[PDB]
Amino acid sequence: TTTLAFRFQGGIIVAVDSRATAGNWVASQTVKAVIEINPFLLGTMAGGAADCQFWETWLGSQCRLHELREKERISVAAASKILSNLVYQYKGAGLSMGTMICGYTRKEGPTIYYVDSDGTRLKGDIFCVGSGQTFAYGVLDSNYKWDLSVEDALYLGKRSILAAAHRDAYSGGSVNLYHVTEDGWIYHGNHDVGELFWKVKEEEGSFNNVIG
Template identity: 50%
Template sequence: MALEDVCGMNKVPFMMRFDERQSMWQQEQLRTATSNFENPYCLMAPPFERPAENLPKILAHCGVNMDFAHGTTTLGFKFQGGVILCADSRATSGQYIGSQTMKKIVELNDYMLGTLAGGAADCVYWDRVLAKECRLHQLRYRKRMTVDTAARIICNISNEYKGMGLVMGMMLAGYDDEGPKLIYVDSEGMKSSGLVFSVGSGSPYALGVLDTGYRYDLTDQEAYDLAKRAIYHATSKDAYSGGIVRLYHINAEGWRNICNTDCADLHDFYCAAMHDKKKDGQNGDAGDQELPCGSGWTSRKLPEDNVQTKLASV
C-alpha cells in the first residue's frame, strides 16, 4: 500500500476499491448539493427546463399529488410616526396547516425589516441572504444599507431565477437617511414604493379595512389598532391566514416589536366590544370606542331578509 501511495496508483480509478469510489462519489454529490454554503447566490436548479411549467406535468405523469397553494396576510403602511408592519403566522400547504407560529416578519438589521409571502422556503432563504449582505455592507462601508439597495438586491435575484419556480412576494420597510421607506418586491422582478401595501391571499380583506381607516396623520395607537384590525378581519375571512398577529413599528430609533396577539384573543375582544356598542346604542348612547366595520348595515339588513323570507313562504 505504501508503494501504491508513493507512485500514486491508488488514485487511478480502475485501481481504487469499490468503497473508496463510492465514498468519493458521495463526497462529490454532497459538495455539489451544498455549493450554496460557499456562494449563496448559486442554487441547484431542477434537472429539466422550465421547472414551473414542466414540474406539474411530471407529477401528473407519476401520479404524485403535490399542492403548492400558498396563503398568508401581511400588510405595511407609512404614516407620520414611521412605518407599520403587521402579519399573521399561519403556514399552509393546500388544506394542511403546517405551522401556526411562522415568523413572517424578519429582522434584517436594527433599522430594516422584511415580510414573507409566497413560498416559505424561498422567502426565508433569501431574507437570510439579504440579512447577511446588510451586515457585510455595514462592516465594509461603516454605514447601514439603504432600503432601496436591499430591494434592488432582491430584484436582481428574482430576475436571475425568473421562470424557475421561485414564488416570493415581500415588503421591505426601514428607516434610512431619506426617512421611512416601504418597498414591495416579488419573484417577477417588480419593485414598487408606496404608502400602503398588503400581500397574500387575505390581502383583499385587509385592504378593505385599510382603505376605510387609513390616513397619514394617524397617531401611534391608532396605527397599531388599524393594523391589528385589518389582519384580524383577513384571518376571519381567509382560511389560509391565522395564528398570531405580530405588529412592528419602525421609526428613527429603529424597529420595535409592539405586540404578538393571538387571533382568538382579538376575536373575543372585538366581539365583546361590538356587543357593548349595540347595548349602548339601544340605551341611546353612541359609545366611545370605535369598532371595525361597525356600519350597522348588517343589523338593518337581516330583519329585511327575514321579512322577505316570510312573505315568500306565505
C-alpha cells in the first residue's frame, strides 16, 4: 500500500494504489484504499485492511450523527479526533492503521490530518503513508508547489504513486485519484499501472533504466 495527500491552491489531491498482500502472495489488485465518508470527507487506508475499513465506515456513521444533532457539517479536526480517540482506547490491543482524514470546510479551508493506531494525530500539508511512502515522498518533495493547477497537481499525485508502485513490491495494481475542493470531492478515475507505466515512460521520457 502507498497513499498520499497534499494541500495546494486548488484544494487537496488524494492518490492511492490498489494492491493488497498476504506475505509475498498478491491477494488483490483492485482494492479501494480510499473511503468516501461523505461528499466532503475522504479517508485513506493503510496497514490492516479490516481495521481501516471497519473503523472508517464507522467514522462516517459518527460524522452523520454529528450533523444530525448539530445541524452543521463536521469539521475535519473533529472527525479526525473521533477516530484518533477511538483507536487510542484500543492502544496495545494490536490495531494496525495509518490513515489520512482529508476534507474542506469554510472555517478550516482544505485540511489533512494524519491519524495513527499508536494514537498519533498530526495536521499537515503533505503526507505519504504505507510501505512505499519513501518512494512517493521523493517525487512529491521535488515537484511540490502551492501554485499548482488542478491538472498538474492531479498528475503529480498520480506520478508519485506510480514511482512507488514500480519500486515497492507490496504496492501496485492501479491508481485511484481524488480531488477535493470548496464544493466537495471529485473522483478522477482508476488508472491501471500496467498501461500507465508505458504511457508515462513514452510521454515523459522517464524510466530509462527499464526497456520497452
